[PDB]
């Protein structure tokens, strides 16, 4: 239940299709590893997980310890791996919660084997930076340590190693093919291949599938956002957008010309306006930044006039409308639309930092089979 | 708990003292009400809450009424005003739960009349709006009509009204003048005064204390925070900042010159370089636009280096750093420090989005009496 008109909706039939469609395009060895990390890309965790399971991914992903433990908190029982670090004293935690960690520094281990002696066998995922500089193992002296440690140690066990791409939406390939390169070069250096070879993020496997090994790390594009604009017609599939976000008139007046409007009354009416007033501001992700960006209104633009508010927020309507009535901020009204990828050339970021930023005050309403499933509201 | 070595720390101390000091300030007969809509601005609402009734606060308020319902099941029992919209089906829940609400429309008190009938009264406060252009009355003969309205309910009481200030945080008070004279001049439309009459936000309250009427709203000021740059050295007693942002070292390395850092590949190294990497991204609220911007570690500034991901992002070390090292992404490290206005600036917004931006995925740490009193991890 929620208590203010202001609302997001995540159709979990485009997240279905967009994993779905990359299940027919990857080999049938080739594993589905769904990327839920920061709460799904502000989706829901568990909403997104279950369909992407159901749609044939095998494996999920998260950023750090606390993500992946909520997961089993809300029943999912299917295997998950940290891509970020962790305490070697939390090893214990995510051996028995079956949390698969991502590793690459041989102090890390020498740490983890003089506090933990079983009895629950932990998986590693070694991490290899071929040029990302992020995260990762770079020499042969580190990599062929941190292997000994694991062989040596009786539940330790190396089930994967990766890599990942910073280039890979670029058209340019260039640096993409010398990061692959090194990683070939690098993958000598252990004595066996473990069964769990990854290095292809959304981009990545969906421009190059044949060479994306037997793992993949499926992120953005399960969202239906494209990890690149200049990818986009590249893209082998059409990506289904998902997430939309609502809310309703609270109050209508007219304005007469010379009134102003909200903090620093930066805005004065020239004319005989309509005002409408929202109930969605900054605290709910919706930054100040956007102000003179526009809203759906009754199937027509609709300017945010004035500063934006910490809950609130002005536009100038067509006209004198009912309140109630529906104002989409990303999403379609009619023959109008507005994505998400509208939201973040105007903030000037990337697609991937708006559905993240709407914060845990929006409630997010499920749809799924086309009907409503279930309503998330953080508080 | 929390299992990623990043998170904020709030000081119930300086908010204990910044709102003991308003106390101080105000005349005895006119109320404290502590605004903590926003989850009290991102520091957490039954933790500020608590500390400003401890402080002298008597009333609280909230944006909208889910904020207020989880503050009574946290255990709040002080008096709650939602300064925002409400639905008119939800009047017999806020009764009930003892929480008064915001009322500028007839034809949302001709809604509510017909759906609620007692037993619970429902205390209102009249908005007018003098020149925010947000919410509010603005003419006479609906001032009237809602007050004949709540009149004839026998479960609905004009417990008080007010107004709120475009510009109290601006040095030139044109605006200010024209607003509070308006107030006066709107208050004459009501037949008899309602027990509680409120304007002041931080700003005004601070710098007009004498003009406040009963009672006060008091916001940003509490967090330590000065409602405008303006506005700074007019403030009547020293602001303490209760917000600090931290995180350590997760891996350390020497990169080479040449090797390139991030996605898109947008930093190279120049020289041999020590790059640390911290666990903490846009996903935090650590937003994409912070890639010029710097930490402190070691009580030094290290500029941060390429862009900034999801959940991670990489800094220039003065050299080699060993990996746990405390770093500070806002507040004090020996002589320097990081404050939100220095943020604010960088990211070219006020002070006020700030915490509010630092999402759900950070712990929050209380502190009070210099010791740690909770700690709360949203997931
Ligand atoms: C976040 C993340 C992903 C997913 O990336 P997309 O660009 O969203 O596909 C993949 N791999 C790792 C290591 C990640 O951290
Ligand atoms: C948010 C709010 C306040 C608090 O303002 P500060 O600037 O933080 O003091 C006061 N009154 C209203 C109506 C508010 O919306």
Redesign the interface.
Known sequence: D????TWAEVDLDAIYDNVENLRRLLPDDTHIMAVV???A??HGDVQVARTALEAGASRLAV?????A??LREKGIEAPILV?????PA?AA?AAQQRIALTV??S?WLEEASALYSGPFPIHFHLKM?T?????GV?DEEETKRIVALIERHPHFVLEGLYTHF??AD?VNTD?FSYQYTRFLHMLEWLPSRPPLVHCANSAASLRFPDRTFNMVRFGIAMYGLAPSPGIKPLLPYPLKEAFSLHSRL??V?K?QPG???????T?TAQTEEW?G?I?IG??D?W???LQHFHVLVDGQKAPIV?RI????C?IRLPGPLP?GTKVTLIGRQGDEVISIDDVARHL???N??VP??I???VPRIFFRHKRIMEVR???
């Open positions: 929620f208590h203010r008109d990390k920061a709460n890309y502000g950023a750090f310890l606390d993500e433990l909520a891509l970020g670090a962790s305490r939390d935690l690459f520094r102090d930076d040029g990302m500089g992020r995260l770079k910073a280039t670029e640096y609270v109050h007046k304005l009134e102003k409007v909200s903090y620093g009354a805005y005002i007033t109930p900054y605290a992700g930054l100040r930044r004035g508010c910490m809950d609130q002005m309140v000037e970021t990337i991937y930092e993240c930023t914060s845990y005050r509201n953080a508080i």
